[PDB]
Amino acid sequence: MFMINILSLIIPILLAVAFLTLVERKVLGYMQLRKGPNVVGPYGLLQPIADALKLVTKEPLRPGTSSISMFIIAPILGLSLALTMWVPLPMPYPLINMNLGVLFMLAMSSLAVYSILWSGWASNSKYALIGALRAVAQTISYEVTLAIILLSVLLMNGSYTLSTLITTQEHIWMIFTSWPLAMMWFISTLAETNRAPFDLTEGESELVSGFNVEYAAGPFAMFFMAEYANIIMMNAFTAILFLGASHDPHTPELYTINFVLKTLALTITFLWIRASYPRFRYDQLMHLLWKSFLPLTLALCMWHISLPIMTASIPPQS
């Protein structure tokens, strides 16, 4: 039944990703005074299934200038890592209770850029290569602050194991202790997931479709799978880190409900900001971080390095 657990961490996640599209097209549309998908069955509850069916029966053309091998290996890489990075999350009890869950998730998040990289390069297009390079710059810039902010926040945890965060936020949310970093962290989660207002890798206005421009039918749906699974997992990680929740050891369902609600709220804020801003211009989102996020996060790193020592509050490692 370990296989049972693995399948229970995949099919529900894929279904949640599918309904993420519907809730996005509804919440966004209601921001814009529209109604969003409404025709298919009741309240559009069948749109994810409908376009899921289309994308896997529509013809998946392969460009004549493509590089077949990487053009195919990129979607597999993206979806596999997006699904894999769900396994160490401490949803009541993590499926894979790793001693270095944070470092593992950082490693797989850094690997996920390589899907974009190989898909963009192998497609043999001007727009695709442009989007690949914008992805290069964006993810390096934001990865530096991702690592520093994770270190600064986890300095109060005592280790990198995800489960102890629940023990850390037993009496107070961690956001009340590191609300500045949290802000920056949230922005980083917006950019690493390659979402608005940093969704310049796609750049629908200026890059048509970015690195998905030559991706059609199944591979495109699969890259979308990776993107939305990453969105939900990032919001889940943010909820785990800062907005901790009560965990009764006898009824983990309470912590499941609270955690799921917090992830839902964070994702809803993601769609909220997606429908309330213009889009950044490449270098700006770099000049935002290398000149405003990086110094502030370095200073906060020193502050959180010193803070347990000056107050005799060094958390235990076990």
Partner: protein
């Protein structure tokens, strides 16, 4: 029986195609403005399953909205070629239908049908966004009446 199974598969596939028609951002002239107004909150393409998407690789229906000229016709034909099948062409407006006002000009294609196979002819100058929505629904019923797997069964 096999006929019933292929019938049900036809209904499922046709329902998916008609319920997730993804159009292309190929507005050319004033007929594009109505193409925007049905995307505006009042008519709202989104509730019918239709969401605008550029990059022809991931679109099904092309609404040729506006005058198709000689200088643009090669681009339109090429771009129609990029669309993976199945593909549909909806022709908005008299200009894209048969020539419209400038039917006798020197640099206007006398109908978009001469370049691509147009599937639905939406008349108007410009057609009211309700009329274009009606044309899209007519295309939806067209996809609903497809008999692909039936013909395959009676190959």
């Amino acid at each position: 029986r096999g006929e019933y199974v292929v019938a049900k598969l036809d209904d499922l596939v046709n329902w998916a195609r008609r319920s997730s028609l993804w159009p292309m951002t190929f507005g050319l002239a004033c007929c594009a403005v109505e193409m925007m107004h049905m995307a505006a909150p009042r008519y709202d393409m989104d509730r019918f399953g239709v969401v605008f998407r550029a990059s022809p690789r991931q679109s099904d229906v092309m609404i040729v909205a506006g005058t198709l000229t000689n200088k643009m016709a090669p681009a339109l034909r090429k771009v129609y070629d990029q669309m993976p099948e199945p593909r549909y062409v909806v022709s908005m407006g008299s200009c894209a239908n048969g020539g419209g006002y400038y039917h006798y000009s020197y640099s206007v294609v006398r109908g978009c049908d001469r370049i691509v196979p147009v599937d639905i002819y939406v008349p108007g100058c410009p057609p009211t966004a309700e009329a274009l929505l009606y044309g899209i629904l007519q295309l939806q019923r067209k996809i609903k009446r497809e008999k692909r797997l039936r013909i395959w069964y009676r190959r």
